[PDB]
Amino acid sequence: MDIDPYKEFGSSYQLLNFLPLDFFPDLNALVDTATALYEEELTGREHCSPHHTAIRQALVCWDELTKLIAWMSSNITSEQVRTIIVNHVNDTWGLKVRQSLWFHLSCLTFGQHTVQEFLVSFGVWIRTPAPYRPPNAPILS
């Protein structure tokens, strides 16, 4: 079916649809961020809050995606077909991963309630036109 992976977390696609598609950080820095904090936590045994659980599936989504890119480049795809696929998966797959990892790692670093206020207040910022808008877009703290 068509479930929302943020539905139990008090969010949706529509809350993330406040965010533009260029706000998100790139993957490797987000990869290194959870590596900096939560490597023993994600590889541990503790069943701690299911934001932990969602990252575990998220990296597995990313890890076999890297082998998938490494497979089709090394074996099958010619150079014209390959660059169209690599551009497409970075704009479709990893974008959802950038939807995924950015969400939960914010919540492990700030809690759930900080995230919920963050998405709405940024939406107020992005709905404001170019005049009458502060150049400080709101961020985390």
23 lines the binding site for its own copies (CB under 8 A) = yes
Site for its own copies in 25-84 (CB under 8 A): 25-26, 29-37, 39, 42-48, 50, 52-61, 63-64, 67-68, 71-72, 75-77, 81, 84
User: Nearest approach, Cβ of 60 to its own copies (angstroms)?
Assistant: 5
Nearer to its own copies, 8 or 113 (CB): 8
Long-range CB contacts (< 8 A, 24+ apart) of 29-34? 30/98, 30/101, 30/102, 30/105, 31/59, 31/62, 31/101, 33/105, 34/59, 34/101, 34/105
Number of residues counted as binding its own copies (CB under 8 A): 88
Nearer to its own copies, 35 or 113 (CB): 35
End-to-end CA distance of the chain: 37
Question: Which amino acid belongs to residue 52?
Answer: H
